[PDB]
């Protein structure tokens, strides 16, 4: 009942996923063919692991 209203508004949890549909529209404008293969995922992945340590706390 007020389960949806209590956590958020009258909107249904599934409606929140509709907002996710907009996400597709956002990436679609950037490039419908925008695929990880087009982005240097391999080089970026290695660099991020080093950067992750910068923002994370190592023991």
């Amino acid at each position: 009942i007020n389960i949806d209203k209590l956590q958020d508004m009258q909107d249904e949890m599934l409606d929140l996923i509709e907002q996710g549909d907009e996400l597709q529209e956002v990436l679609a404008m950037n490039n419908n063919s925008g695929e990880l293969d087009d982005i240097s995922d391999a080089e970026l992945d290695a660099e991020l692991d080093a950067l992750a340590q910068e923002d994370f706390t190592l023991p």
């Binding site: 929140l16 907002q19 956002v26 923002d55 994370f56 190592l58």
Partner: protein, 167 residues
């Protein structure tokens, strides 16, 4: 690996400060199984998992309805569905994670990029891993791949943001 469990535990505390114990409640459960699913455990990690069990039972007891229902068995009972019904909670947890994740990609469209966004992206990645671990049986392997792609997208863009490529 083990550090991820600490982030999840600390991240769960953040939701409590915001009053979203329901979100932190699932995060604590994800880290608990995470430690058990870890082959390497230390007296500190083993004891840390035990303390989390007390919180889960204390949190669930807070809304279990064993006595709280007497005070209010109508609205609290439905809220219990969020904790007791893992399938229904899965959708809300996914909607919450997707809502935060959707905002990050929306900002990528034209929103301002900064170090603060860098830390927020790392937080979203943890939420996706928890959703898959909390309900691997309720998520098909193909459906899981779609979620992993969203996490990977942040991993690639997060690197570009730190490289000053986006902005």
């Amino acid at each position: 690996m083990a550090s991820n469990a600490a982030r999840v535990v600390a991240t769960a505390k953040d939701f409590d400060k915001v009053g979203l114990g329901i979100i932190g409640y699932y995060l604590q459960l994800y880290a608990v199984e995470l430690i058990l699913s870890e082959e390497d455990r230390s007296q500190e990690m083993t004891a840390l998992a035990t303390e989390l069990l007390d919180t889960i039972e204390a949190f669930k007891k807070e809304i279990g309805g064993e006595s709280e229902a007497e005070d209010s068995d109508k609205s609290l009972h439905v809220m219990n569905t969020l904790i007791h019904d893992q399938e229904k909670a899965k959708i809300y947890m996914l909607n919450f994670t997707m809502s935060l994740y959707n905002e990050k990609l929306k900002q990528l469209k034209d929103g301002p990029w900064d170090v603060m966004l860098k830390r927020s992206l790392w937080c979203c990645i943890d939420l996706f891993s928890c959703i898959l671990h909390l309900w691997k049986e309720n998520i098909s392997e193909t459906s899981t791949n779609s979620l992993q792609k969203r996490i990977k997208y942040c991993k690639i863009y997060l690197s570009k943001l730190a490289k000053g490529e986006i902005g």
